[model samples]
Target chain A: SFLDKLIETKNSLYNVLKHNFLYHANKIAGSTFTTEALALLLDKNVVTGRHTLDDVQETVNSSYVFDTVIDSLKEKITHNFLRNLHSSLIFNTTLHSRGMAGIYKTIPNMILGTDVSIAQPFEVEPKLDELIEWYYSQSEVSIKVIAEFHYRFELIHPFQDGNGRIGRFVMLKQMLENNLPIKIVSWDSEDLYRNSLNSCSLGNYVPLIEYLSSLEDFREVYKMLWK
Target chain B: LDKLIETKELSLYNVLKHNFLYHANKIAGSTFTTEALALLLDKNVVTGRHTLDDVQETVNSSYVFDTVIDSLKEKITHNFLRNLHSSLIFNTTLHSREPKLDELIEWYYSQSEVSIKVIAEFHYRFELIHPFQDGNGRIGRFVMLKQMLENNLPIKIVSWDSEDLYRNSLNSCSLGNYVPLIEYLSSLEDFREVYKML
Candidate 1:
């Protein structure tokens, strides 16, 4: 049972990170690599139920297949986080086959909508441009930018499927982008993260920006309620 | 003087100051380079890109240090797309071969409303572009602040390492729940202070 749980967590963690990474990568590199390949690259370090970074190639010997690096600095932060997020988005279906899926029923409906026929591919470039222009225009601080990237990404729904899962990874990829490794928020914090959406969904970037900036408060709630 | 230093916090701050000065002296012991100072503040190891000798040479070569004040300065706010494009190059040098940052930034900015979902989508797309090679974090952070500033708001983004809010935002972003991240940001108290009209 211990091994089973560890395996499950490991696979699940991989699912979460890879999905986010790949989807974000898609936006940049537009690579031909299947989501499965991306997943394999990420899990390459995990062998026989263990983790190691030795598999990571240090040099920029090859192009990022899609887009490369999250920033332009000479220093290298781990890009595996991006890969992890990518897998979570594009390869959720692939993971489901491996039995690593999450229960996010409401998620698919948000982007995919009720009509399956309407899910056909559309040119995302125009919508993508609109989103970025607005993003730059706002010019938020680091944390808010980290959070805002998630909001606008989902609305654009550039892909036919996996937008839900992929969108979330975008947020995590950001944390890794900023040097934080793993994040864990509790269920009680859900209300704060949720309420702002309902109130601001009508039309108000202010409420949403405020919601992200106050993440500390929700974490505070989680600690108090659980501890 | 000893009697005046009653608080431990104050004493600790003083000790930190002394250590900083001691290290500064050690670094300046040689002709310190800009890279060396940055290294001292950062990992304390000099990378090949910069050297203390270079910085000292620059300082020594200049006749009037005040001449620096008269240099021309240009302000250019790269749109979100440009910033995202720049971010990729910032991290991955090879990406410079292809540049589509302006196209991407333009897509993000043209949207009618800055909804939670829209914001998350834009963020994901920007990262994918990975336009910058080095400054994704700073540029992304700047975008958020600039947006707020444009709104005539002043509160900076709040970040606390111990909290999982950041993760939750990312999780929500991945899950396609932009609302949560937006909800979280809206809850900051500093929002009240940022409401000032410029």
Candidate 2:
């Protein structure tokens, strides 16, 4: 049942979702890769013209992992899966650090201009361990659960880098698994994404949850709420 | 009313300080802290802009900084905005680009009245037109603040923490959806409640 729906959704929406996600995810992460450049890079496997080496290459890497990593999901996601995914994300790109890809952070990290402290390097393991445990314990993987999981994952921010992209990939995976329309966040939704998360961390989950749900299809969400 | 006017004077000066810093930092990459820029404006004190080439931007920025409020008192028009624009970007750049401003101003006057939707929409279009090579943002804000004052909307400054919402709203507004921009502008402080949203 789980496999059938995820396989179906990904089979149908994979191409569209990848373009939207790669362009906007990279953008929200501060990458300057153009959608045209990304589309060209993915289709051609190589592109002409000079650009930022890291931004351009990461577009390819993002596409590669979008298929390989997300499609390879199991009922239970492990550390190695995430690490391997992170590995491919910056693999052979300027964003990659020595021995850093697929590796947990070894230093403190903070989202600038905010007070949220991401799980520190030493705490990354235990925090993620608890996170994965929480993941498995949930029999119901509703959109709410998925959104909550995403908030927790981002809060933990286990990786040295690539957390947002990887976290988004997981949200995609959960949607696939649950047979819901995967929420491919728009470039415009970038602000709502941050604000909803900020609201979530402040202990109200409704905004973030609704943000993810509404992204599925606004008409359906409106129907469910209003009608 | 006296209390409100006095408070607005001090508050708007505070407003100018941050707006000046944002213009310098975001536009010119000048490193001016809040207090440093404030002292530079208030006391004619000096804060470095890291290089001599950049001091002129800071200087140009300071000149127009006072002119923002001055421009507010007069009616908002493309002619007035252009005059304000000259002073703001005097020596920042000689190259210029004009896309749209007069039409936007014409539309502004055509409107029945200005609401948050009206002013925010105007601000969104102003930034998109970006008529000047530099000081587009400063001019946009000055025009926005003037419209807000004309219709008695709200008095708020987008600086520091409020900038994220402000920046995002501009992006969202471009998509023909003004709710995000409208919501944020509405979230700003009015004369009576100027502190809450900040």
Candidate 3:
């Protein structure tokens, strides 16, 4: 039952990556995608990888993000991330592809409410500058500020179609770069995470903080996956 | 079963230490040459003549001492108790030049429950006397262990909040209240197992 629970957790995480197209197309369909499933897949392979579950776990273990300064990569990195995310989502999902039609390349020129629209045009350079400044203002050690970055970036709804996925991807990227202590936003707890996001919408990060602290097990799993 | 065990332990201890009982008993603040001997033996430090060896040999020279020494367990018990009592004096003030064994007997017998009270009183009085130059606690603790073993008492004082209870017992014994210790032992079945396992 524990194995089943763990397996289900692994698959659910893979599903999130797949759904958001954060993963490469081949990886989403491959035998080895999410590290846990990949390890199992590797074990089941005709010619298996030399490493065991412990080896795969290493990658997952290193999820902790920390304080850092990166003034130069602030803007174009955000935009560069947006571009690949646009490609990943466009190629990956049917609903996303249709919803994203004509919306991928264009910046909404007007406030498009909660949804992205290629039908409008807008300049996000000012918003991006504001976000960078606000990012600096937030104390680097504060967890709430980090979660706020994720939520606020999403609300800015930058990069039309894949904003949600890209926001998470950025968080993951930042975590990787800063060596943050969290890993694997599993699709298993997607509903809980969504609810936390919604709670963040009301400007309270208590729920998100509680969720992140409870993720030590996920951090362990991530370690088991990589190293 | 509980009463059976308790009585058996007490009976065994009483039988072993009954002879030379004077040597085992110590007042609150008297030290003895025997206490010095125990510390020497425990620390593998050699004692010069005319100390524990002198006293032990002198006691053994008597017919009564010979009879007491006949039981190996009793002999060891007397040796340990006398040494601890002496160590208690020498290490402390030794305000009185020699260890007065009679005072120790009087104080020990004065307590209704000797087993629990002896340890508490011994610790306090031994510390007061500061019997040996070093290893007061070590010698005292060994005396307690030797006390338990000679008596064939399986129970050890385990799981004791030693710091708190030891302090409380020291205070209580100073005031002549011996019941707290008996009550303490009675409260914890686990305590018995703790000592026994050790």
Best by TM-score: 2
Model 2's TM-score against the true structure: 0.48
Among incorrect, acceptable, medium and high, the docking class of model 3 is incorrect
Worst 10 residues of 2 chain B by lDDT: B46-55
Q: Rank the models by lDDT, top first.
A: 2, 3, 1
- Every candidate's DockQ is 0.01, 0.01, 0.00
Residue-level lDDT tens digits of model 1 in A1-227: 22133135435533443344443334232233334443554444211111111111110111131223232212222224433334433331223444323222222334322222221124344555655565556643265564555555555555534454455445544454454322322123245544544454313456656765654432232332222
Tens-place lDDT per residue, model 2, B41-135, is 55544443223224345555665655655555566666677777676555333425343667777787888877878887888888788777666
List candidate 2 stretches off by more than 4 Å.
A1-12, A48-50, A218-227, B1-198
Per-residue C-alpha lDDT of model 2 across residues A1-227, encoded as one tens digit per residue: 43453346561344555677778788887666567656665665444333344555566678878888556765568888888889988875544647787788887877664688678788888888888898879987888888888988988888877898899888877776666655766667448888888877735579888887667652233333223
Residue clash pairs of candidate 2:
none
Ranking by TM-score: 2, 3, 1
Encode model 3's per-residue lDDT on A1-227: one tens digit a residue: 22233235443543333232322222321213354443433333211233222222211211110011111223334454455445443442332444553243354532233333323225455565677677666556355666777766755665554455446656654553444564444444245665666566536667776766665543345444334
Query: Could you tell me the fnat of model 2?
Result: 0.00
| CA-only RMSD, every prediction | 29.5, 20.8, 28.1
